[PDB]
Design a protein around this ligand. Structure first.
Ligand SMILES: CCCCC[C@H](CC(=O)NO)C(=O)N[C@H](C(=O)N1CCC[C@H]1CO)C(C)C
Ligand code: NI
Length: 160
């Protein structure tokens, strides 16, 4: 288990470095991955990005049993597939006790590498696209409050 960094920590604000090709397939990467899934499962998350546990790497995990397959995504690139935007509720492990409505692209393509270095290339919609976009934002130092445009919908979970 690792400790989840909280909003205000400068490490959530950095642009993350790519996973080097040296680490693809490695034991060391695999152990980081196991540690991430163990952390995410312990606190109930649907996703987790490496910088949230203080590892400066373009690596994300996500999934849950709107079903999203368990997935480990390295070095990602996201491409919006059209202009359609949708609002949905988000919260974040790094921003405990809050929720906010955020407008994200409805449809994206995402690509990157799996942990063995095999390419990933998928086009998704709705909740799956929302999760990817949230997680990838961590890799460019963006948390969801910096994406809100309707502040009438941002507030404490226990109030909302
Ligand atoms: C959909 C927004 C992406 C959520 C990703 C976060 C996990 C996280 O810290 N990602 O880096 C999460 O699991 N958040 C949960 C969350 O936002 N949920 C619970 C299930 C769906 C959604 C509803 O707000 C919890 C912490 C409240
Ligand atoms: Ni988050």
């Amino acid at each position: 288990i690792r400790e989840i960094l909280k909003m205000g920590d400068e490490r959530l604000l950095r642009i993350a470095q790519p996973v080097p090709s040296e680490l693809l397939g490695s034991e060391e990467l695999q152990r980081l991955i196991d540690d991430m899934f163990e952390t995410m499962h312990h606190v109930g998350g649907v996703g987790l990005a490496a910088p949230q546990i203080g590892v400066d790497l373009q690596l994300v995990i996500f999934g849950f049993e709107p079903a999203v397959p368990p997935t480990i995504l390295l070095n990602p690139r996201i491409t919006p597939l059209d202009d359609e935007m949708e609002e949905g509720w988000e919260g974040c492990l790094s921003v405990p006790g809050l929720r906010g409505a955020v407008s994200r692209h409805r449809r994206i393509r995402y690509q990157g590498l799996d942990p063995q270095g095999q390419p990933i290339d998928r086009s998704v919609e709705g909740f799956h696209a929302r999760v990817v976009q949230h997680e990838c934002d961590h890799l460019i130092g963006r948390l969801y409050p910096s994406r809100i445009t309707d502040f009438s919908k941002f507030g404490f979970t226990e109030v909302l």
